[PDB]
Amino acid sequence: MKGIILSGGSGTRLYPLTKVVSKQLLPVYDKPMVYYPLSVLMLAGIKDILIISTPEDTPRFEQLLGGGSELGISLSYAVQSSPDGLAQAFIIGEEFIGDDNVALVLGDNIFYGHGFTELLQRAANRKSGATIFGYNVKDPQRFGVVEFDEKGKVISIEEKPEEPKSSYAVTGLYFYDNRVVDIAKNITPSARGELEITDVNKAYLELGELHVELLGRGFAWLDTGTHESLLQASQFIETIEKRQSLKVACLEEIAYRMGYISREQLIKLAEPLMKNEYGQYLMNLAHRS
Ligand SMILES: Cc1cn([C@H]2C[C@H](O)[C@@H](CO)O2)c(=O)[nH]c1=O
Numbered sequence: 001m002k003g004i005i006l007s008g009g010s011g012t013r014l015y016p017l018t019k020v021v022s023k024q025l026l027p028v029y030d031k032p033m034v035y036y037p038l039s040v041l042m043l044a045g046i047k048d049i050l051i052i053s054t055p056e057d058t059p060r061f062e063q064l065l066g067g068g069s070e071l072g073i074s075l076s077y078a079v080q081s082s083p084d085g086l087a088q089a090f091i092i093g094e095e096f097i098g099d100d101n102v103a104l105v106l107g108d109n110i111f112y113g114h115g116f117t118e119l120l121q122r123a124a125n126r127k128s129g130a131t132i133f134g135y136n137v138k139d140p141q142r143f144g145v146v147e148f149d150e151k152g153k154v155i156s157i158e159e160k161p162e163e164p165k166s167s168y169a170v171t172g173l174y175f176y177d178n179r180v181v182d183i184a185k186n187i188t189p190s191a192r193g194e195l196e197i198t199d200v201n202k203a204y205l206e207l208g209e210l211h212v213e214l215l216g217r218g219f220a221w222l223d224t225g226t227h228e229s230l231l232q233a234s235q236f237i238e239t240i241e242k243r244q245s246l247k248v249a250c251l252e253e254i255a256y257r258m259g260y261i262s263r264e265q266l267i268k269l270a271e272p273l274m275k276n277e278y279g280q281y282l283m284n285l286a287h288r289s
């Protein structure tokens, strides 16, 4: 399965932070934002990943992450000329996707919680339909909103409803079969002038093939869309990491844990970073039993 990170957008709300740095290059505690959605695709077992960003920012992401060989993965890059909707990911990424199933993750979403890798690996191994992830939120009218019955069957999905039918946001992580490319080609802009992911998901719902996994209250799903929310996400990750000996979204650790890279390869990544605590962490892991 392949994956796409949609890592463009204007980041207008974060001005002036996003005058000359991509929102997705801003820190979440100690790591560039994009590390977090990338780590989610890696943990799902996805090794062939396309990163989409603006004309100006795409080369900045390639500078940061390269082609992926350090991580035992393949990273490729494409440009989105204007932020005209999430569903454009599949249009820009058509040649990349080919005949394969594909997951999409949004650049500014931060997922963390127990039990998450099992849900990911389940979604990644589901060969048919669309899987979305719902999460109970305070202000559901800000988000795509999924309404489901007693058996978890989707009833409705609506983008930023004025009268939300549930408190469940449709978070920025989506797994699709190959039908998504033709679906994305056949939707039209909304009132926001965007080719909405919600409309991709409605196409699967028409077919009875939109499947929702619930991310329960013990899970954290944050986004970094405002100054206040970006600082709050940074604090959250800081708290988790301070207490534990383990890091969140340490890409090189994940590459090792997923078996994408060897112990020797991890040592070689740690060496030029021994001047800092991040390299020290990687070295310590490589030498653990
Ligand atoms: C609407 C839109 C969002 N984005 C990204 C920026 C944020 O990470 C997220 C916004 O939901 O998606 C794009 O890259 N292109 C777009 O067209």
Ligand SMILES: Cc1cn([C@H]2C[C@H](O)[C@@H](CO)O2)c(=O)[nH]c1=O
Pocket (backbone or CB within 6 Å): 039, 043, 111, 112, 113, 114, 115, 116, 117, 247, 248, 249, 250, 253, 254, 257
């Ligand atoms: C195993 C591993 C999990 N995680 C995250 C995924 C889940 O949100 C949480 C529990 O697995 O920790 C990492 O960020 N790095 C790792 O190396």
Ligand SMILES: O=P(O)(O)O[C@H]1O[C@H](CO)[C@@H](O)[C@H](O)[C@H]1O
Pocket (backbone or CB within 6 Å): 086, 106, 109, 142, 143, 144, 145, 159, 169, 170, 171, 172, 196, 197, 198, 223, 225
């Ligand atoms: O934040 P945006 O771009 O308004 O909203 C976008 O991401 C949200 C998740 O972060 C989803 O709930 C929305 O369906 C999607 O259109």
